[PDB]
Design a binder for these strands. Sequence first.
RNA 1: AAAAAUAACAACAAGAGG
RNA 2: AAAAAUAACAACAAGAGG
Lengths: 67, 65, 67, 66, 65, 67, 66, 67, 67, 66, 65, 65, 262, 262, 262, 262
Amino acid sequence: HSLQDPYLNTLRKERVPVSIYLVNGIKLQGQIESFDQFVILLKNTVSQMVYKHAISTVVPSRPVRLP
Amino acid sequence: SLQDPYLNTLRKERVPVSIYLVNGIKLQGQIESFDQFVILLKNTVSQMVYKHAISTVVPSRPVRL
Amino acid sequence: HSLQDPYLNTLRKERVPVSIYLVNGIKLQGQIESFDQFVILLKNTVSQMVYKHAISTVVPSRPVRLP
Amino acid sequence: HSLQDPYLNTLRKERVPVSIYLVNGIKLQGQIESFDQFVILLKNTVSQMVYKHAISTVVPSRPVRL
Amino acid sequence: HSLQDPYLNTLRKERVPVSIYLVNGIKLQGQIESFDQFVILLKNTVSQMVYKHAISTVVPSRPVR
Amino acid sequence: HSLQDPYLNTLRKERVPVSIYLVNGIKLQGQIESFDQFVILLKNTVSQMVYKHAISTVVPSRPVRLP
Amino acid sequence: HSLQDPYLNTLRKERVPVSIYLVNGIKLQGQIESFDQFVILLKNTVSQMVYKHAISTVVPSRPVRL
Amino acid sequence: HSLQDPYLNTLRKERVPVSIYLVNGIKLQGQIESFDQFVILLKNTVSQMVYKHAISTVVPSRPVRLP
Amino acid sequence: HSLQDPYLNTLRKERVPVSIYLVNGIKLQGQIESFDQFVILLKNTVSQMVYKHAISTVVPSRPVRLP
Amino acid sequence: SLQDPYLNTLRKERVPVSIYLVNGIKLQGQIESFDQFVILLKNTVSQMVYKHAISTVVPSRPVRLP
Amino acid sequence: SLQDPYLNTLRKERVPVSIYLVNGIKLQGQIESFDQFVILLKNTVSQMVYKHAISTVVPSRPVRL
Amino acid sequence: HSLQDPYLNTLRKERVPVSIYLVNGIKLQGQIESFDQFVILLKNTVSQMVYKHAISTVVPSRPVR
Amino acid sequence: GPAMRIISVNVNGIQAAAERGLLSWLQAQNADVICLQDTRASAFDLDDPSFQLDGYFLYACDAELPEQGGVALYSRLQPKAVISGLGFETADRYGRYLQADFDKVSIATLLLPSGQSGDESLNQKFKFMDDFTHYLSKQRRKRREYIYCGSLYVAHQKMDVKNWRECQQMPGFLAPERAWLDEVFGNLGYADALREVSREGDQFSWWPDSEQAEMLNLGWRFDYQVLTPGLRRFVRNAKLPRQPRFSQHAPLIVDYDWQLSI
Amino acid sequence: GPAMRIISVNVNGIQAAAERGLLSWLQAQNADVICLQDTRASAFDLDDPSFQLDGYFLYACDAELPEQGGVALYSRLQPKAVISGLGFETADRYGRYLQADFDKVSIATLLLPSGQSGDESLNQKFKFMDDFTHYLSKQRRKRREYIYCGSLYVAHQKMDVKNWRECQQMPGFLAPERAWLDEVFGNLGYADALREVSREGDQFSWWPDSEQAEMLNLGWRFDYQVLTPGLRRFVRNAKLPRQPRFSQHAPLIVDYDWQLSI
Amino acid sequence: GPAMRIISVNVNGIQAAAERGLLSWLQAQNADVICLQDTRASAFDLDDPSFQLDGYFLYACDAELPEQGGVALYSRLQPKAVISGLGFETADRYGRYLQADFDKVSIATLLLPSGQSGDESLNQKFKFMDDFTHYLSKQRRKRREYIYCGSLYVAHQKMDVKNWRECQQMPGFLAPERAWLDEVFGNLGYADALREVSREGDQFSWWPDSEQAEMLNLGWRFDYQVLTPGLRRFVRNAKLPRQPRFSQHAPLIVDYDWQLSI
Amino acid sequence: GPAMRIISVNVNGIQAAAERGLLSWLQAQNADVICLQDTRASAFDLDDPSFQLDGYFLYACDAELPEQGGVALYSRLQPKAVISGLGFETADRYGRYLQADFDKVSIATLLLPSGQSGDESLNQKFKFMDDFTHYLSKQRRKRREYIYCGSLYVAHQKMDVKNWRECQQMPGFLAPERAWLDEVFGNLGYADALREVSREGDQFSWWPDSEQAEMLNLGWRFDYQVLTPGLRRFVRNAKLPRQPRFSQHAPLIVDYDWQLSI
RNA sequence: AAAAAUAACAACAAGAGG
RNA sequence: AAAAAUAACAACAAGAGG
């Protein structure tokens, strides 16, 4: 639990445009509104809700640094 | 948790959500109820959708939290 | 399972024909004969058990509603 | 596990030829030697071990009773 | 835990050319270096770290136990 | 996890370029920089966060042993 | 031709409305007006000339006798 | 020429139900009333004059022989 | 010889918009330039040469009569 | 002409022939008799087929012209 | 009487003509020779076409008699 | 007639492979073994007689004369 | 060695044909799968032990109004899966499809709106034909073979009717209808099991209830066994029995070289 | 890129349009196909070498009383064929059809009776429409594509006429006149060339000779191009230029993506 | 009939083009999608209502150094998605790509470097063209349809631009730049919106700021719309109006037969 | 009961493969039809009694210059008709097709340009692929059953190659080539005879002459038996023998349930 | 290399090959 | 109603149903 939440908080602070890759190859660009350990919101034109078990990767577009 | 307040906001405002499953299936409708393991989508016939099969949930109109 | 099992019990009690769409997309007609926390029997011609982690959706064929 | 165990024990003790359909769609077929909280041991030419998180359905050839 | 530890420990120490079929249906031939809960080390030219939750079947190549 | 973490930490400290395969068959390349209970941080021109519930195999490019 | 000429002559002395089937199956209708060795003049709205090397059958509508 | 005339005289005199298949493959089944060296006249309801050059085969129904 | 030659001569004198039907159903409008025992010339934008053995019917578009 | 030696050789040797017509229909039998205009062959009944509808005549056993 | 002067007049100056058969098959090419039963057409090889298969013969350039 | 016989005899002497098209659109393909006024027998594997009134076009597979 | 027999008789109400002696005839034909269409009874009426042949499993799909449709399937062996409906509305609600599922092959009973009632029935028939072609277009991607035993109420070509020159305007021989059949059999590769063996005229299936039509054989051919392209070489013997009739329709008995399994 | 230029113009007499400048404007267009409808002149009147244009070929079909109708056709390309008359009564002696056959395609100039000078012309028009629909049903089995440059004198839907509410009973927008085109473009299923580049109205092709109709735009839309299925995508440019007009109708120019070949 | 309007304009600066009357002309078009190329403006610079269009949603992607480029996209329809950046280095740091994703179709504005200010911009343009070819070869296997409103600054082939005989080695009409487009419109199978309704030259979208290019028409043709091959049929109207323009580039107005929905 | 065996080995020259013992191997396999591709010999060179098996009729179609193609067929029964050439230029001239016609089925032999020479061979290969797909689209309607025993030199699927991540640019595994075999097997209904029986990996046909690929099984699967849809259920046993090879290609031995007649 | 066979399209300006 | 199984598409803004 020690390393997922600071990474997602760091991607939340700087509002970096990120891409969530789902487990079937679907990429979803946007910004991360908020999250829990089962759910991640995403800010595009619409505001959608993603479950973490269907997420494969979360990639940013700018190089980000962890505290 | 923001999952269950998000689903309560989708239900009480009655938003025609679209549930995208983990294999690409798109399912429109309104939400009757939700539990820890299941959402219920209401349409021509009401169905249960298991929560471990859902990729995303997308509302139709842009709603707030 | 506060809301998962007034629904399957209602489908068992009235012998409502259901379609279980799996996560493959394979749809299985039948009627629910028994269910525990983990598996569901359907009985088209030969009774079979279906694991709930392989089930995507359980739809009925005529509209039934919860108690 | 109110109903998980006696169905597989009835397929095991009666030695019913059973057919396991996986979550990929693969039709394995053999006999149930033994099982636990996480696997099925399947008897054929050689004993496979099949994880329950890949099993979609378990289909007997002759019907069984609790 | 139960039956899978006695099963895999036999395939280690009798050094049997197993074949691991994944959830998406991909066979990996080789041997088993070692394991614990949700890892199997698949032995080849390069030792792999295969997750158990991504494995459908373990198939021995010779009849064992 | 009694044999997962020594393998991933040995892959991290020696900085072996890996080929991490996903559950849908997607190969990703780079090197391991951080592993939690749930995530693995692949590194390439950017820094990802892959989830352990979507990884099939972790394949290094050069053969290493276990301490 | 010693037995097709009395037939095609008594089809027009009585003026029987014939149906003439060609060699490709086309059903023409009308009344026979004149016949040569080679042609038959089928009379209708217009009087067309049907060659005998394209005719399969000549049927009458009412039965006649020679 | 020297062999079809007694065959057709037999098919008339014994009054056998012939079936004439044309050069476009159409079965005209009836019984031969007369024949010239250019035509055949048959009937089942109304007497037809079928041209001989449009005929492929003349198949009888029961086997008859040539005298 | 007793009808086809005066009939085609009557169609030759008056410029009747004749239509020749071939044995496969092909319908050719035109006008009759000349003819002989075996072939017929047809007048249109180009001049056609149609053999008599492929002609099914020869129909006029204006009603004519024979002397 | 090689009409008559080929047809007599199919007749007298009693070779099963297959006869393809101008519309594509094959008629398999044995040449009982043949004239200048007709071919009478026998499978079940004696069948008179005109030569102006014959496209090809193949044998089942190859023959030699005498 | 009318056929063989027309075929001669059409085959001297080598008009590329189309012979339409009784099937509907058209054959472009110039006529090299003819006799009482046969025509002979040339586009890529000197084939022989029987006249009892020919429906029409249509020339490309409008020629005279 | 007097143009068909040298053509077929030249195809017989050289054993040029010919394609005989029939009047029902069937392409037979063989070698002209012999002929007469009314029939042409070709050989592909079994010798067969072909009536000339059912032949539309005789196409050689390679040029001649 | 291996053989299979499928009978696809249309009954025009199962009770009237059972009074006229259907079941004692079907018991003595040694059919593997019997494919009944236009049952005109609900599934609560077919578990009556008068309709139960012995040595057969009876599976039945009803209509929502039980006199409007209805479909049943007797099977020698118990199938792997018996499913019902097609998905679109003019089949699923009115009981016009039932699919038994076996080892490599699958056998489907099929009923259609006749179109001979009025113009509304003809519009329902045309939308059924279009949605059914839309279904059959998607079936070529799967490897489960199909045998559609269907009372299609549509003749295909001029040999399937008597006196076609006076039948071009009656429903059953229309130009969009024959366009539909030679689009299904022609371009989609499917095969008529009655035409894969017997290419003969005067083989009819339906007759109107006028006795002068029945006396002089003024018939129609309406029910077919439509086959996926892998099964066109297994058809041994297809026949329409003329005399032993039990409805306005005659049975269709097709003998295949297939060996039916579980 | 293919560019085939077809103009359909309805002249109401070729001399009454040529005095306004029909020939001098059409000679500087380089059109591939010219369809002169209602020429109102005999064939010998078009033998005047004034009407002979810059390398165009003339083909014309007149009436018995030549002012009742008559169509004409100009083409640079000498066609494979040119045919006149459909084959029935009210089209042959009125000069109301002329079809030029090129390779793979045919054009056809067509004229209809107006039906506004007595009810006998209206019954003539209904006769012509009925057996014209029968002709189209006979032509649907053929392969080659047809272009019908025609003045049907009928509108098709509600979006086609101005002053909607009292046009229900005038000859030109009647109920069976509308039903004719809604089964032609419906169950039969032809296509219109003016719609395939402009799915919006407010563009007409006939004005009554009055000041209020030519100022306040009281127009009707008559000159159409009816297309068989197969030629529905190749149309690119359909223009009805308003003020440049030599009759009560409007001149129509269209450019198709077709390689017009002999 | 559907009607979707996409206006792609390369404004060479949104502030430099708004003083000529850009927003006042674009508000009175009722355009569905507006694609602004080379805005030279940041995202915060577009936030004021001086650049806003009322009723149109605006999404814009700027450069890092905002004097280099940046694109913008107006649509009154709120899309399913909008994405920026192609997926490599020399496109995300410039604002040279912005793709709005609706259902069944995507509309993407695209900007390219000019490559005429030294060999370094030409080599960077070659890098961009090569990995953009790699991106299109990746996006071929997807199902959904794409629209690329792109200022490629490259002509395709010989008959495209005026007086090409001295334009052989200038950057913009080079040999590998034409090889790029004849393999994209070759093996990769894309098409243009301008070619389907206009198969000729003499219509340009780039003029240098000189009076000889104003009068004697020294024009280049750069603003294109690249289509996936499942959209080339629905192209109806393409318009490059000359004088009505508020930048060096020529505004492109296109009308498709597509129904743009949410 | 009934059985049939077809061997479709590629020899890379019959004189060079007969020295390695092909004919003494083929004599002892009990094959009904042997399908030799790439004969590299004229038909006069196969006339000597060195290539003649006993109990087999040998029919051969040569190339013009003989080292490019050449195709032979050994048959147990004498076929009804042995024809050669497809009808276009890149097959008939270079000897890449031969067809033996039997009672209901017809067994064909097919050779292709390998495409591994350069770019001209790859262009000739793509031309052959498109023209042969046109041939299959023409032959889909015919009522014969075909068995195309073809050295296609194209892998279909990722399982048909070893280490596909560096084979996407070598000819044999290109994207148009895999799209071609996805078109032939997928949408045209044709069936792979080796994939009906075995659905397992490590079944390869071709190996390059480097021995490092040979002893570690770095192979390709090039030759197939493409089947019409009526024969997909008759396929009992298809296998590629690894060890007893006589060229760069391995033989393909397929056993069918068909009973081959005259 | 060919439907042991369409009681029958008032009519396919024409399938370089039905 | 389901390929006894693709040593593996740096990735289909998503097939009302692989």
